[PDB]
Point group: none
Chain length 92, copies 2
């Protein structure tokens, strides 16, 4: 789509501080389900927000990758995520 | 197997900030049904996630323990090593932490 947002993020343990649900095997988009306070995903600009939909992981189109394959791409990471922002909460 | 080991210190009121359902008497696995924002369960690393199934509590296998026994095990401060609750959980397959 248009108005995608590029989020950049450095790990803490190798951790970013966010949860994801979804994936091709779940027939659901990959959605950020929790961003924990004080973590890289919480403190980065632009912020990673819950309800944001992950579109690219380090340039890779993940639309047809499974939940567990998505998780492995993230941990195999800066982390570059291209997200479709949730409609309810916006960063400025 | 794909288990996750979690350790968690209680808040100032001795609470951890999650709900459990299930147990031997319910013929249902012990599952985390809610994890409240900003509670120890939400903020621990690895995080405790909703839908995670509890396998061990402070080293104890809870497979044949009742719901009320399981709750008692979580609340028992004298079974905690270094003031921490230990849980070994099977992560829910839908939500993952990174």
């Amino acid at each position: 789509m248009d108005n995608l947002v590029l989020i950049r993020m450095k790990p803490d343990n190798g951790r970013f501080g966010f949860n994801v649900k979804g994936g091709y095997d779940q027939k659901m988009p990959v959605i950020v389900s929790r961003v924990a306070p004080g973590t890289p995903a919480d403190l980065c600009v632009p912020r990673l927000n819950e309800g944001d939909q992950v579109v690219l992981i380090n340039g890779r189109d993940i639309a047809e990758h499974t939940h567990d394959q998505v998780v492995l791409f993230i941990k195999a990471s800066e982390l570059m995520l291209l997200v479709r922002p949730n409609a309810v909460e916006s960063t400025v």
